[PDB]
Design a binder for these strands. Structure first.
Ligand SMILES: [Zn+2]
Ligand SMILES: [Zn+2]
Ligand SMILES: [Zn+2]
Lengths: 1199, 116
RNA sequence: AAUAAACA
């Protein structure tokens, strides 16, 4: 009954985008947002991985952002953000220095039932606009209530202008904008006071209107100055034209207006569908035939507007201006095509952003050509798993033979991302699976190091045994070396490179050798009473640390280079536990060219950062091993094992602090913070970041920095659950697990002749593995992904298991030409004969592809193209019973498809059962061994809407019936049916229980006996429910019915006949309620990694790019965390002032039983002092909860 | 294919236990009903069922050779006192009235039997 | 068999 929701993939895809002063007033910063996540991107121009959008901060909300505007308030040093959340919550937030989080300035809750005027079902979204002078800002709550926020505390109390109690009876708002010029915040408001529909224009010709209301802030009145009242009936968004021209452009579907207060109306028509539909005086735009219904636009400084249409076509509208600053005529130019957008932003002049849900939302660059036509170039593209319509689990085809006999399933998912011109398949695969190119069995060694000996190949591989040291001469073929040079008679605790790869320095417990490769220059004995346990390295600096805490410094000097003893002046009040060195190729560590820094952690809980040529104290945390969320300087205790400072990103810019503190990983960012202490200190701080990783099962290191492995720099975090830390020029931190080969002891970058830039690690069982990262994925997204651009809307995907191929339904856009009638004898097809100034409707022709997993190209001579008007409603992988193979089932690909020809033609359908059969390939094309064998293709008696399999029976949905066909040799013989509800658009089933899903009415569970050929209704839902798709929550004995909704919900139904609140087995009952942030169409189960013997993780991929999960639990482990969650909900400073309890409510009783693993993840984020307090306040210790929250992370580490 | 990875063939769910012994099906009201949408009771085929007339699920009898023509559209007043069959096998339909009596048929997709 | 054909 109980579950935990955990969000495996953050939602990629941007619904809102702006360009504001988020971090300070000096630089503007592209703040973009999506569904329940904010992103702030900087702008590089000199990047190695050329312009590139570098992420600077990202923020998760407990609520979907419904609009976003920004305004620099009175005397503020930053730009606030007016967010807007569902059911009319405004939230003015700001970035804060110090703590690198947000900071809520104000919370405005407008969810009063008298502000609705009875309208329960909120259809209008709350829309936030700002006055460009920063005088006020207005939210349109619920369509009918202008909430005005006056500005100057930096604020004034709001008020709610009633819209319907104005003049002109506005009553159906379309868009509202703050206009330019003026002395008061004038707000233009498009509306429709007598509403009509495109499709009913012969009695209601043109009803759109405009009121430019002028807000008096102090007196709190509002004159309705300037109204026009016979604008065309289908006007989409309004747009405020800036100051030097003023006014407004009002996008209509088939026209485009320019309106102003002192100027007569001027608007042209963009096709000949404005003939009998508009009485407004429309001219004829020459050489243009397009439409503007979903068309995002922004303005070039003056008189140039970039319209991206539907279809992703960028037009740069020129408003031709007279000498009296009035618009005379328009001027289009068909500029380049680009992403199917949902937003638009002018950045730095000459850069545009195209925020899009469905497509990689990318950064453009326009230039002037040699009037003023602009040519576009794509500079960077934010990767964007789009609205995942369907997604299927597949097995990868390049698993190396060493990992072959592994007990866990090893699989990936293929995701139908995008839409239309940006449609795709995306290959999502959570972990990293290396390519083992050469293995070795070298027992006895436990650490490993790589150096470079003479464009930088790893010359040696240095192993340390318990009593000896190996040498591995690399080259054409690697071989153990026996000659002089290295100290092979004892162990080594460090071996690395000094200078710039000109000398090799290993650290024996007695001393240190200087090596030019195989030859040694000299030896310096270390006469400390304690043996050396570890070291760290800079380019000229060698820092030794003994067992008793004694620290010495070595330093190169020219002559030939030789190390010199240098004693550090240190005050040893308490013994040093562990060290780390660091340098600044690109430095924020200013304390006011490489500036070297020495980190040093003392056993009294402190932490010290020194500039390395001197030894002066620059930073000091008093109580370090607690895990405090912000490390601010001040210039039992859990043991600190290893500390790592490494620079990641473009040209070694941003540092991170990885520390290991007693079976707990907590790593820090690093960000500037100017601190007025005067004596010379670090003007930086450290912010802790969330994780998923636990360290629970000479000195061995677990933090191994690697540069230039498959183009990437970063840190491989070793241990019991190994992880990768990848930061590209994007600047975003990526945590990719590596659960194959078990736990990992050591690691090294490896660059060879026969091996490419790859890596090299120990198994736990002492197996040295030369390995290469697989080269087809991209490890820069939150999961490793390869994008497969189909350039046509992928509707479905179906991994055919036998012969191991994918079968994708697609659709491209063909301009329609015929209108099917049905006049009494047969179909008659009226040819569309219209003007040459006419745009055509879209006819979509469907074809079923065949994508091969080996190399991800499609397969030629395998494309089932359907009829003229036939639309695929479903593709699945269907297992039907047969007497050929040794089993019963076979595993076909069945697809249902029906003909859409408008509401006057009876839609009929056709079950298309296929089969992928390996034939001999064509010589030269080894992909072409795969080819369809269409068994069944016969027209049915109605539209085929959904397919399912039940013990080898085909279960299909035709009309208000659900059919059960069986596959004979060539014909389908019907066996069972039931007259079901309206439109069954999803059915999945298991063990003869059919779970249907209507669009409006109800899900049903059905049941098929074999001995009596009968399908029947066992239990249905009785209430109306606007389903998207359904699933199967599986417990040890309970089967839950996970059913997503239109209203971004999840809910688990169960069939409980002994319960009295339903009828006796005739009504389903929901037993968990949850509110996902996003719509969900895809659903699948997996076995998780005695408890968890028989429970399944029923994952899903949301329709905003994110992938979630619902791991079932028991009653005891749930309520030890619901006590935590209620303690986490109240006693924490949530982002933007949001309430995580009320956001994850059902949004109709809300019988919630599903936790939030993104709020419970904050308990893993608290410091261990703060951790113990909330444990005592609920009545436990942290170690019971950490045994409960890390076991919901371990069993969910698939893909 | 959902049955290689997350297979559930070895699970005896509480859902399957709920539908063998029927788990508390109420004896249906109003004894002039139809028992429509209900599959079959296994208590009648093996042995005595227990309740007669007022029972939820369907009770079958032999010697039914022709499927019911009204039942296909979803109009079964008779229910289990029907003298015609309630499967979906397309071999036990009646002869079509207009092919047997009035020469040829009229529609193109006549389901009913055409014998000569 | 109880309206399969109830047509303009
Ligand atoms: Zn019975
Ligand atoms: Zn009947
Ligand atoms: Zn007939």
């Amino acid at each position: 009954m109980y579950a935990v929701y955990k969000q495996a993939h953050p939602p990629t895809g941007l619904e809102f985008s702006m360009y504001c002063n988020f971090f300070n007033n000096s630089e503007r910063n592209l703040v973009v947002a999506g569904t329940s996540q904010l992103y702030v991107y900087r702008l590089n121009r000199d990047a190695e991985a050329r312009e590139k959008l570098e992420l600077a901060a990202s923020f998760s909300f407990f609520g979907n952002v419904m609009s976003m505007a920004s305004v620099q308030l009175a005397g503020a040093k930053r730009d606030a953000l007016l967010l807007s959340f569902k059911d009319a919550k405004l939230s003015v937030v700001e970035y804060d220095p110090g703590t690198h989080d947000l900071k809520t300035l104000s919370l405005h809750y407008f969810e009063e039932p008298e502000l609705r005027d009875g309208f329960v079902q909120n259809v209008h979204t709350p829309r936030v606009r700002v006055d460009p002078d920063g005088r006020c800002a207005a939210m349109l709550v619920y369509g009918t209530r202008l909430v005005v926020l006056p500005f100057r505390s930096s604020f004034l109390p709001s008020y709610i202008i009633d819209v319907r109690a104005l003049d002109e009876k506005l009553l159906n708002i379309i868009d509202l904008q703050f206009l330019h010029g003026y002395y008061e915040p004038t707000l233009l408001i498009l509306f429709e006071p007598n509403q009509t529909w495109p499709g009913r224009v012969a009695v209601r010709q043109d009803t759109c209107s405009i009121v430019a209301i002028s807000l008096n802030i102090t007196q709190k009145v509002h004159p309705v100055i300037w109204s026009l009242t016979s604008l065309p009936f289908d006007c989409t968004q309004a747009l405020a034209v800036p100051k030097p021209i003023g006014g407004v452009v009002v996008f209509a579907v088939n026209s485009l207006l320019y309106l102003n207060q002192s100027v007569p109306p001027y608007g042209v028509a963009l096709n000949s569908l404005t003939t009998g539909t508009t009485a407004f005086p429309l001219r004829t735009q020459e050489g243009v035939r397009i439409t503007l219904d979903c068309a995002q636009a922004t303005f070039i400084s003056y008189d140039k507007m970039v319209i991206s249409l539907k279809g992703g076509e960028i037009y740069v509208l020129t408003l031709i201006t007279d000498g009296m600053r009035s618009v005379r005529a328009f001027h289009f130019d068909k500029a380049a095509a680009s992403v199917l957008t949902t937003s638009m932003v002018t950045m730095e002049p000459g850069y545009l952003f195209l925020g899009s849900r469905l497509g990689n939302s990318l950064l453009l660059k326009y230039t002037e050509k040699l009037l003023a036509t602009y040519s576009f170039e794509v500079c960077d593209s934010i990767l964007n798993i789009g609205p995942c319509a369907n997604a299927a689990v597949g097995e990868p085809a390049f698993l190396s033979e060493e990992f072959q006999n592994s007990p866990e399933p090893d699989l990936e998912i293929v995701v139908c991302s995008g839409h239309g011109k940006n449609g795709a398949l995306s290959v999502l695969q959570k972990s990293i699976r290396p390519q083992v190119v050469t293995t070795f069995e070298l027992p006895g060694c436990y650490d490993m190091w790589t150096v470079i000996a003479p464009g930088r190949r790893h010359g040696f591989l240095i192993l340390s045994r318990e009593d000896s040291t190996m040498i591995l001469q690399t080259g054409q073929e690697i071989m153990e070396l026996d000659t002089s040079g290295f100290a092979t008679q004892g162990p080594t605790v460090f071996a690395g490179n000094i200078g710039d790869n000109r000398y090799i320095v290993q650290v024996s417990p007695l001393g240190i050798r200087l090596l030019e490769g195989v030859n040694q220059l000299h030896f310096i004995p270390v006469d400390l009473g304690a043996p050396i346990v570890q070291c760290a390295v800079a380019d000229p600096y060698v820092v030794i640390m003994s067992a008793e805490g004694h620290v010495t410094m070595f330093l190169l000097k020219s002559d030939h280079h030789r190390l010199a003893l240098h004693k550090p002046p240190l005050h040893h009040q308490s013994k040093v536990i562990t060290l780390c060195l660091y340098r600044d190729l690109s430095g924020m560590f200013t304390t006011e060219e490489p500036t070297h820094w020495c980190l040093l952690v003392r056993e009294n809980g402190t932490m010290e950062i020194y500039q390395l040529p001197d030894w002066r104290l620059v930073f000091l945390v008093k109580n370090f091993p607690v895990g405090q969320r912000v490390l601010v300087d001040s210039s039992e205790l859990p043991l600190v094992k290893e500390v790592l400072l490494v620079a990641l990103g473009s040209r070694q810019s941003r540092p991170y602090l990885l520390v290991h503190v007693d079976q707990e990983l907590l790593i820090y960012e690093a960000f500037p913070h100017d601190s007025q202490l005067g004596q010379g200190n670090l003007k930086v701080r450290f912010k802790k970041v969330p994780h998923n990783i636990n360290f629970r099962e000479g000195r061995v290191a677990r933090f191994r920095y690697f540069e230039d492995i498959y183009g990437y720099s970063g840190v491989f975090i070793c241990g019991p659950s190994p992880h990768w830390l990848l930061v590209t020029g994007r600047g975003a931190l990526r945590l990719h697990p590596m659960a194959i080969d078990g736990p990992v002891d050591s690691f090294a970058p490896f660059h060879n002749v026969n091996c490419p830039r790859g890596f090299l690690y120990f198994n736990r069982q002492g197996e040295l593995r030369i390995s290469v990262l697989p080269a087809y994925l991209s490890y820069d997204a939150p999961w490793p992904v390869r994008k497969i651009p189909l350039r046509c809307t992928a509707h479905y995907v179906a991994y055919h298991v036998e012969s191991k191929v994918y079968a994708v339904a697609t659709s491209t856009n063909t301009p329609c030409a015929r209108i099917p009638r049905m006049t009494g004898e047969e179909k008659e097809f009226e040819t569309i004969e219209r003007d040459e100034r006419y745009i055509h409707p879209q006819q979509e022709a469907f074809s079923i592809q065949l994508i091969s997993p080996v190399s991800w190209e499609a397969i030629p001579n395998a494309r089932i193209e359907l009829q003229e008007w036939e639309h695929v409603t479903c593709m699945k992988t269907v297992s039907l019973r047969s007497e050929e193979t040794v089993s019963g089932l076979k595993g076909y690909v069945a697809a249902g498809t029906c003909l859409m020809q408008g509401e006057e033609v009876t839609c009929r359908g056709r079950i298309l059962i296929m089969d992928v059969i390996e034939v001999v390939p064509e010589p030269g094309q080894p992909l072409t061994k795969n080819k369809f064998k269409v068994l069944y293709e016969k027209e049915q008696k109605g539209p085929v809407t959904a397919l399912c399999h039940c013990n080898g029976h085909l279960v299909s949905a035709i009309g208000q019936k659900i059919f059960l066909w069986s596959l004979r040799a060539s014909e389908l013989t019907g066996m069972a049916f039931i007259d079901t509800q309206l439109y069954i658009h999803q059915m999945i089933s298991v063990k003869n229980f059919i779970l249907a899903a209507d669009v409006m009415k109800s899900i049903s569970l059905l049941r098929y006996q074999e001995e009596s050929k009968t399908l029947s209704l066992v239990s249905r839902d009785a209430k109306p429910l606007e389903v998207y798709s359904v699933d199967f929550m599986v417990d040890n004995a309970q089967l839950g019915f996970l059913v997503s909704d239109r209203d971004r919900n999840l809910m688990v139904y169960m069939y409980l006949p002994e319960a009295k609140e339903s009828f006796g087995g005739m009504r389903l009952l929901r037993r968990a309620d949850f509110h996902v942030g996003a719509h969900v169409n895809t659903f699948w189960r997996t076995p998780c990694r005695v408890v968890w013997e028989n429970k399944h993780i029923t994952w899903f991929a949301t329709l905003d790019g994110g992938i979630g999960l619902l791991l079932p639990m028991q009653e005891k482990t749930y309520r030890r965390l619901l006590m935590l969650q209620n303690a986490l909900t109240t006693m924490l400073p949530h982002h933007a002032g949001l309430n995580p309890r009320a956001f994850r409510m059902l949004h109709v009783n809300a019988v919630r039983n599903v936790l939030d693993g993104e709020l419970l993840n904050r308990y893993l984020y608290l410091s261990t002092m703060e951790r113990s307090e909330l444990a005592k306040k609920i009545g436990t210790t942290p170690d019971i909860i950490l045994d409960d929250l890390l076991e919901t992370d371990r069993v969910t580490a698939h893909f | 294919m959902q049955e290689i990875i997350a297979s559930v063939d070895h699970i005896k769910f509480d859902l399957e236990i709920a539908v063998e012994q029927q788990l508390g099906a109420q004896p249906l009201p109003f004894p002039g009903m139809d028992k429509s949408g209900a599959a079959v009771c296994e208590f009648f085929l093996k042995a005595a069922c227990g309740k007669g007339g007022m029972c939820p699920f369907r009770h079958i009898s032999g010697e039914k050779t022709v499927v019911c023509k009204h039942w296909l559209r979803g109009l079964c007043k008779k229910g289990d006192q029907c003298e015609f069959l309630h499967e979906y096998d397309m071999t036990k339909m009646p002869e079509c009235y207009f092919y047997s009596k009035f020469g040829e048929c009229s529609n193109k997709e006549c389901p009913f039997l055409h014998i000569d």
